[PDB]
């Protein structure tokens, strides 16, 4: 195990001296921002407090070196600088964490990357997306398997730029700017125009938890009145979705490649069988099997 560490420094060509620091970097300000409160007071990032404590102790070290303070003070101050830089990089790693106001351990640079709230899992493996919505789901028996019914007010916002384009084309609006104002004021012209936009433009429906890939499926959107999403009764099994307050999220594919992927790979009608067992899922399951 020791060789495992030593041969690395041997071959790579980097000196082990890097493990001991003579200078510490300062993270840009926008990544440690200081915001203002509605009461006139200020709130700041914990990194600012950590860096500030380190700077205070470092400047005190310079003072002590210049003043020829007793060796005891200089050494006992270098120790505190060590502990403060240790907290800056990974607070709480050694010993007791640096407590903030309220006996709350301050976040460190290494805390920015760990766990569900870390950068990797929270902001890299899964982002938040534009052109998306969510609403309550309702069973729609009359729908076809490849169809889903979304509210008008959902589609209008989702397809806002498309509606603006077609409103300025058909001369319902003088310029694209006034088209935006028209959509934001919900003028009656959009509802007839919106239908042309959503025509054969598939959307993606997702229900958390997304356990398997059939937890997301593509559908052709149908403008429905009301404010609930209308879902086909046969896909409930795949989503494991009952109708007692369940909510589903809608995503609008934009690029031509995205629309093709949704139309061919992810359309509900092309995913009737369970990928785990091969047995069908979109089949008569509850009331349907009873009638038959």
């Amino acid at each position: 195990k020791r060789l495992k560490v030593v041969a690395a420094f041997q071959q790579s060509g980097n000196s082990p001296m890097g493990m001991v620091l003579d200078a510490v970097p300062v993270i840009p300000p926008e990544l440690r921002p200081m915001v203002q409160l509605d009461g006139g007071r200020f709130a700041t990032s914990d990194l600012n407090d950590l860096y500030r404590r380190v700077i205070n102790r470092n400047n005190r070290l310079k003072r002590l070196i210049d003043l020829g303070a007793p060796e005891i003070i200089v050494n006992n101050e270098k120790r505190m600088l060590q502990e403060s830089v240790d907290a800056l990089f990974d607070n709480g790693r050694r010993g007791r964490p640096v407590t903030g106001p309220g006996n709350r351990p301050l976040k460190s640079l290494s805390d920015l990357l760990k766990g569900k709230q870390g950068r990797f899992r929270q902001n890299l493996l899964g982002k938040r997306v534009d052109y998306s919505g969510r609403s309550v789901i309702v069973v729609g028996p009359q729908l076809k398997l490849h169809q889903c019914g979304l509210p008008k007010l959902m589609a209008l916002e989702l397809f806002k730029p498309f509606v603006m384009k077609r409103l300025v084309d058909l001369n319902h609006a003088q310029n694209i700017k006034s088209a935006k104002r028209m959509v934001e004021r919900q003028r009656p012209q959009v509802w007839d125009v919106l239908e042309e936009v959503i025509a054969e433009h598939p959307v993606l429906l997702n229900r958390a938890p997304t356990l398997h890939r059939l937890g997301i499926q593509a559908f052709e959107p149908m403008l429905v009145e009301g404010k609930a999403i209308q879902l086909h009764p046969l896909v409930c099994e795949a989503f494991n979705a009952d109708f007692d307050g369940d909510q589903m999220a809608v995503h609008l594919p934009l690029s031509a490649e995205a629309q093709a992927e949704a139309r061919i790979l992810m359309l509900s009608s092309n995913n009737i069988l369970s990928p785990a067992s091969g047995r069908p899922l979109a089949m008569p399951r509850l009331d349907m099997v009873t009638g038959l």
């Binding site: 790579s12 980097n14 000196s15 890097g18 493990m19 620091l21 003579d22 200078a23 510490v24 970097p25 300062v26 993270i27 840009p28 300000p29 926008e30 990544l31 440690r32 200081m34 200020f42 700041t44 600012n48 860096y51 500030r52 380190v54 700077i55 205070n56 470092n58 400047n59 070290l61 310079k62 070196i65 600088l81 830089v85």
Partner: protein
Amino acid sequence: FFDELRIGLATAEDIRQWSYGEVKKPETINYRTLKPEKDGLFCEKIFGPTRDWECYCGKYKRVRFKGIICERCGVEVTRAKVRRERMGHIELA
């Protein structure tokens, strides 16, 4: 398109090569003028201007001065976007 992502130990020389200046003073900002203190954790000479093409001393507030290092406050004149990428550093005694 870029092939590999290399990671390694940061030499002190690299730490200094990244930094646009050393953070000497421990102050943060001023609680009246909202201006970041010079050589502080928000020094505009080091990290960048608070507002686009606006220097600290207020001599250069226009876009005509693109790339001018102000002589009275030492702040460059680019977009505030650089406050998201310019690193500082503390030189340890």
